[PDB]
Amino acid sequence: STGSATTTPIDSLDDAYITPVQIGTPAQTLNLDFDTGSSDLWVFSSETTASEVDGQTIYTPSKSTTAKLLSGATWSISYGDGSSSSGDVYTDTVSVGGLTVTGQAVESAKKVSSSFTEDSTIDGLLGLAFSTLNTVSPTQQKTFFDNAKASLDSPVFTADLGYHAPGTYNFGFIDTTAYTGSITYTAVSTKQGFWEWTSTGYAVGSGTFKSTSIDGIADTGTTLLYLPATVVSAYWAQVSGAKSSSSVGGYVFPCSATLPSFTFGVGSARIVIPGDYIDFGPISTGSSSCFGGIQSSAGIGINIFGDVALKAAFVVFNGATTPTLGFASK
Ligand SMILES: CC(C)CN(C[C@@H](O)[C@H](Cc1ccccc1)NC(=O)O[C@H]1CCOC1)S(=O)(=O)c1ccc(N)cc1
Q1: Shortest-distance Cα residue to atom 33 of ligand 1
Q2: Domain 5-174 listed as CATH 3.30.460.10
Q3: Which of 62, 241, 255, 292 has its CA 20 to 30 A from that of 317?
């Protein structure tokens, strides 16, 4: 089997991407944030505290003939941005672009934190990291990909995110028309539960490529590119007037600047992020100070290859018995 679904930016800045998911019988369609850096599938629901729902589409398990409460199971998650959610758990039928899993754990939110309430475009998360990070207690649950894996033609999914445009998630096959050149595969460590790999270096604009190992995670759920402070300083030094602002929370730059590209290494291959991909616009409406798309990972504890980097590539999440990651230019 295979599946394919279109993923769409939530706004004009690519602040996140949403993908339609069918849940239950008859189907209930929710727009979820596919997140290769977490492992819970959770949704806004008829159980969510009413004051914490503001425009999201909700899952109502009592209207689904295939929903069954998973007795005694609860879940509670806290994310890297300080947001959180928690609730109870049903099993139900879940499909993504034609690919169906029966008995998927659907974690129904009873509480969500303010940043989820305030974002009316995201109805939940669909985690695609390793199931070792799933938070369901006392019986841990599997991700949608882990449940589908054995049925798929090949045990893979791919991410092809667009810059200011829609893109595609495919399950079970590699679309060889979607990239240029060849796919370079690189080794993965699953010890922390993430798609964790090692980049071979970087360059700023047309400058000299620096060979240096950069450990980090491939994360569709993170908007920006978070890298070591030495690397990020080298980038922004090439933008006149750019500086790190403690009060805003990162590097900002004059909106009048033209940004250089940023290249990262995958083995001997090279992925080029165009400068325009690194512009996230005015810090507040009407401001001439703009927020940068490359930021320091200091204080996170981990480097994160988020959407700013992933949308410049065709990315293969290979879930063979020894997982790997593949990157191609496009
Ligand atoms: C709800 C999603 C988006 C949560 N984030 C992305 C996730 O992939 C996030 C990535 C991450 C991993 C490790 C350390 C720090 C961050 N994983 C995460 O925290 O995993 C926890 C829960 C399970 O085990 C560990 S985010 O980083 O908070 C974020 C928030 C807002 C924006 N605009 C962009 C990113």
Answers
A1: 223
A2: no
A3: 292
